[PDB]
Swiss-Prot record, chains A, B:
InterPro entries registered for this protein in UniProt: Chalcone/stilbene_synt_C, Chalcone/stilbene_synt_N, Chalcone/stilbene_synthase_AS, Polyketide_synthase_type-III, Thiolase-like
GO molecular function: naringenin-chalcone synthase activity
Function: The primary product of this enzyme is 4,2',4',6'-tetrahydroxychalcone (also termed naringenin-chalcone or chalcone) which can under specific conditions spontaneously isomerize into naringenin.
Keywords, sorted A to Z: Acetylation, Acyltransferase, Flavonoid biosynthesis, Transferase
Enzyme Commission number(s) from the entry: 2.3.1.74
Protein name: Chalcone synthase
Organism, scientific name: Arabidopsis thaliana
Catalytic activity: (E)-4-coumaroyl-CoA + 3 malonyl-CoA + 3 H(+) = 2',4,4',6'-tetrahydroxychalcone + 3 CO2 + 4 CoA
Gene3D superfamilies hit by this protein: 3.40.47.10
Active site per UniProt: C163
GO cellular component terms given for this protein: endoplasmic reticulum; nucleus; plant-type vacuole membrane
C-alpha cells in the first residue's frame, strides 16, 4: 500500500553479477606486421617515405599482433574520400556504422544470451554503448528489433562514450540490476573504426597512434542480481562498487571531435604518466574500506589504451608481470577496441582461469579491479569479486 | 562483511524524490505570430509563396506564443550557410552547441542547486541529456568543470536522445538515487536548435514542423532518496515507477539523422494516432497495480511534441480540459524544447499549485503520470506521487 512497501518489494536483494559474456569481431582482420605497407598503399600515401617509417616504428611498439576491421580494401577502393586525410566523409561513415554497429553487437549478444541459457523475453533492460556513429532511433532500438526482445525493454543509449565506457556500462548495469527485482540487463559495447579511419599526415601525428591501435569488436553481458541457480544462472564475477574521477592537471589530455571529416582525436599531455601518477588514489578509495592495500593480491583488468599506460602502471605499482597478462593478451590479439576491450579481458580471464584449473574465475584470487581510461582524463574503477570454480 | 551486507549498507532506503527544479532559456526569443515572416526573410526564401503559406498555417495551429532561440538574426546574417536549405554546416553547428548546451545547462543547474540549498560538493552524480551536438569529453564533463563539482562525481552522458528523454533522465536518476546511500543526482536536460535550423524547402515538408515547433531551453533537477528535513530538503514529487515501450506498427515514425548538413528529421505514419491508440496500454501497465483506472484522477505531464498529440490523447481518454493545462502552457510560452519540456511542465505544475493554494504539488491530487514521446516510436511512462502543500 505505502510507497515504502512498494520500494522494498520493487528492488533486488544482492550484488549485480555478470551472468554471461559473449564477444564478436568482424571476420576481416589485418596482421600488424603487414599494416604499415597496407595502410600507406590504400591511402595513396606511399610517397610519404619518412612518415611511413615513423608509422612502422609505432606499429612495432604497439605490441599488437592482429586487429579486426570492418573496413575492407575492396570497400575503401570505392570510397577515396574516406582514404584521404581530411575529406568530407561523415555521411559515408555514418551510413556504415549505423548499420554495422548494432549488427556486430547482435552477434555478441546472441552468444551471451545462449551462455546465459534463459529466454530472451526475460531481458528487462538494454544498455548499448558505442563511440562509432549516432542516429535516431539509436543502436539500442536496432538491437532490440534485431534480437526480437520485448517491446517494453528499458533502454539506455550511450553514444560517443570513448575508452572508459566498458567500465561505465558496468556501473550503469550495476544500478539497474540492483534496484529492480528480477531485472536482467543486456549490455552491449560495439565499436567500429570506420568513423576514425583516414589517410596519414605529418600535420596529424596523433592520428598515427590511433591508426596503429584502434580496432573493431563487440562484447555483450547479461547482468543481474539474485541469480536463480535452479534454472542454471551462475555469476562469473560480482560487482561490489563502481567509481569515476577526473584526474588533476589533465584538462585537455584527450579530445575527440565529430566533424564533417569524421571523428578526429587530439592528444596532449602525458596520458600514461597522468594515469600512473594518480591511479593509487583510486585503488585506495576503492579498497581501503575492504581492508586491502596489496595491489598484487588483486586480479587486474585495465583498459589497453596502449602499451605505455600498462607498462607505466606496472612499474609504478610494482605489479608482478602476471597481473597485466590478460589485458596484454587482448591488446595483442585484438588491439584497442575502445569500450569493448575490458569486457574481452574479463572473458579471457575467466576462460583461462577455467583452463588452468585455478580456484576462482579471477585467476584463483578473491578480489579484483577493473579500470576504464578515457577523455577527461577520466578513470573509472570497478571492484569485482571472483566466483569459485 | 559479506557482499550482501556491503550491498545493504551501500544502498538508500526510500523512493527517489525531485528535491529541486531550475530552468533557463536563451534571452533571445521570437514571437510565433512573427516567425513565418522572419524565418522566410532571413533564409532569403520569402519568394516561396506557397511554401510560406504552408508554414504560416502550421504556426497558426501550433498553439505556440513564444520560443527562445540562441540563434540570432545577426549571427545568421554572418553565417549564411546555416540559412541555406542543405549546405555543409555540421562543423559550425557543433562549434556553437558544444559550448552553448553546457553553458545553458549550468544556468539551470545553478538555480536548482540554490533552491535545493545544500553545498554543491554534496552532488555525487551528474546526468546530462541533450539532442544538440556531441563531443569528447562530453557536456557532462564541461558542466562538472563549469560548476566546480567534485572531480569524483559519477557521470552519465546521454547524447542524441530526443523528445522522450526528459522521462529517460527521471528513469536514470531514480535508479542512481535509490541504489546509492547519500546519492544526490544533478540532472540536466539542455537543448539548442542550432543543430536543426536551416532554410525551408518544398522538398522537405517534414522540416516545416520542426521549424515551427522546436525551441531552446534547459532544465535541472536535484534527485535523491532519504531526504534530510533537518537541513531543509523536501521532495516536490516522488517517483514510483518508470517504464518504456516501443509502439506496434510504428517503425520509422520519427527518424533523425546527424549529417554533414546537421540534424535532419524524417516523419512517417500518424504519430498522434499511434500514441492515442496505444497509450491506455501504458496507463494500464503503470496503474493497474495501484488500483487506479480513472485517468482524470491523475495529474498529467505529457511531452508537448505538438498540439495534435495532446488533442487526440485528450479525446481518446476523455480527459477534462484542465488536465493538459500545465503541458499546454509550457508549449505556448516556450515551444517544444525536446527533452527539457516535461521538466519545465513539472515546474509549472508545482508552482501553479502553490500559487493557487491547492492540497498537493500535483494540482491537489495524489497520483500522476509523466509521458515522454520520441523516435521508436518510444513512449516512456513515469508514475509520480505528489507531496502535500
Amino acid at each position: 500500500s505505502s510507497l515504502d512497501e512498494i520500494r522494498q518489494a520493487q528492488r533486488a536483494d544482492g550484488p549485480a553479477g555478470i551472468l554471461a559474456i559473449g564477444t564478436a569481431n568482424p571476420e576481416n582482420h589485418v596482421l600488424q606486421a603487414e599494416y604499415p605497407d597496407y595502410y600507406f598503399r590504400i591511402t595513396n600515401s606511399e610517397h610519404m617515405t619518412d612518415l611511413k617509417e615513423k608509422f612502422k616504428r609505432i606499429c612495432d611498439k604497439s605490441t599488437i599482433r592482429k586487429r579486426h576491421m570492418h573496413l575492407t580494401e575492396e570497400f575503401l577502393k570505392e570510397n577515396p574520400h574516406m582514404c584521404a586525410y581530411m575529406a568530407p566523409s561523415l555521411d559515408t561513415r555514418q551510413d556504415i556504422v549505423v548499420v554495422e554497429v548494432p549488427k556486430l553487437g547482435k552477434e555478441a549478444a546472441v552468444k551471451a544470451i545462449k551462455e546465459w541459457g534463459q529466454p530472451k523475453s526475460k531481458i528487462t533492460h538494454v544498455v548499448f554503448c558505442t563511440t562509432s556513429g549516432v542516429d535516431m532511433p539509436g543502436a539500442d532500438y536496432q538491437l532490440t528489433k534485431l534480437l526480437g526482445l520485448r517491446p517494453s525493454v528499458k533502454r539506455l543509449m550511450m553514444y560517443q562514450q570513448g575508452c572508459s565506457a566498458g567500465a561505465t556500462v558496468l556501473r550503469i548495469a550495476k544500478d539497474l540490476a540492483e534496484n529492480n527485482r528480477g531485472a536482467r540487463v543486456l549490455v552491449v559495447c560495439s565499436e567500429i573504426t570506420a568513423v576514425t579511419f583516414r589517410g596519414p599526415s605529418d600535420t596529424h601525428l596523433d592520428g598515427l597512434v590511433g591508426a596503429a591501435l584502434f580496432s573493431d569488436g563487440a562484447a555483450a553481458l547479461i547482468v543481474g542480481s539474485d541469480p536463480d541457480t535452479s534454472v542454471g544462472e551462475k555469476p562469473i564475477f560480482e560487482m561490489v562498487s563502481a567509481a569515476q574521477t577526473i584526474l588533476p592537471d589533465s584538462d585537455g589530455a584527450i579530445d575527440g571531435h565529430l566533424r564533417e571529416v569524421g571523428l578526429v582525436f587530439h592528444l596532449l599531455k602525458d596520458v600514461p604518466g597522468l594515469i600512473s601518477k594518480n591511479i593509487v588514489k583510486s585503488l585506495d578509495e576503492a579498497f581501503k574500506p575492504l581492508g586491502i592495500s596489496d595491489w598484487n593480491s588483486l586480479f587486474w583488468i585495465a583498459h589497453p589504451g596502449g602499451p605505455a599506460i600498462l607498462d607505466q602502471v606496472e612499474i609504478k605499482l610494482g605489479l608482478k608481470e602476471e597481473k597485466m597478462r590478460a589485458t596484454r593478451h587482448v591488446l595483442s590479439e585484438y588491439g584497442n577496441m575502445s569500450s569493448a576491450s575490458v569486457l574481452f579481458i574479463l572473458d579471457e580471464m575467466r576462460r583461462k582461469s577455467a583452463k588452468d584449473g585455478v580456484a576462482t574465475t579471477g585467476e584463483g584470487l578473491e578480489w579484483g579491479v577493473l579500470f576504464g581510461f578515457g577523455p577527461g582524463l577520466t578513470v573509472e574503477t570497478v571492484v569485482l569479486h571472483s566466483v569459485p570454480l
